[PDB]
Design a protein around this ligand. Structure first.
Ligand SMILES: COC(=O)[C@@H]1CC[C@H](C)N1C(C)=O
Length: 182
């Protein structure tokens, strides 16, 4: 409907796949080469389905900060025959607050879904399903089951992936440029 949705759509059309694990179907953001991200609660194994195709996982790393606190981001390298468009230049370098964000989801349950979530707070610490978690972003939208792995963007930045909610607020794990230096 406007330039926020324009940037979100451009990321969804080229940089997402549908990932299926034993824990469900997730929006999965491709970042560069064969490297993608997914919420750590997806429990990625040796094999994952990518757009309903059996795919070997070459590497998977559940990120934690230097205090050994969960960040809820798993970086996956996929044995896929095709690279993602490199979007690392759209990742923030530092923890920050944002205005006017969009959460975008693409699964069998929610195809081509875009939600204007508004203001995003650097929330920091969250007890996420009983797990102490750092670098959480918060937005005042009642997100539901099905949206995990959804991409959070502003105009010109990819800032996080949706990892949970409490019925009134939604929560995303930050994406930082320093996670994807090669
Ligand atoms: C992921 O967005 C893109 O590919 C570029 C980045 C700059 C501009 C917003 N844009 C659009 C809407 O085509």
């Amino acid at each position: 409907m406007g330039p926020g949705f324009d940037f979100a759509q451009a990321i969804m059309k080229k940089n997402t796949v549908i990932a299926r694990t034993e824990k469900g179907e997730f929006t999965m953001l491709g970042v560069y080469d064969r490297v993608a991200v997914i919420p750590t609660h997806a429990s990625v194994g040796e094999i994952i389905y990518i757009n309903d195709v059996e795919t070997r996982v070459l590497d998977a790393c559940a990120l934690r900060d230097l205090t050994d606190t969960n960040l809820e981001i798993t970086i996956v390298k996929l044995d896929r025959n095709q690279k993602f468009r490199d979007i690392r230049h759209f990742l923030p370098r530092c923890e920050d607050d944002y205005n006017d964000a969009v959460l975008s989801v693409h699964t069998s349950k929610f195809p081509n879904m875009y939600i204007p979530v508004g203001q995003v707070t650097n929330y920091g610490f969250l007890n996420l399903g009983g797990t102490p978690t750092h670098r959480i972003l918060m937005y005042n939208f009642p997100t539901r089951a099905g949206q995990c792995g959804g991409v959070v963007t502003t105009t010109g930045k990819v800032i996080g992936i949706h990892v949970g909610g409490n019925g009134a607020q939604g929560f995303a794990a930050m994406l930082l440029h320093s996670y994807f230096t090669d």
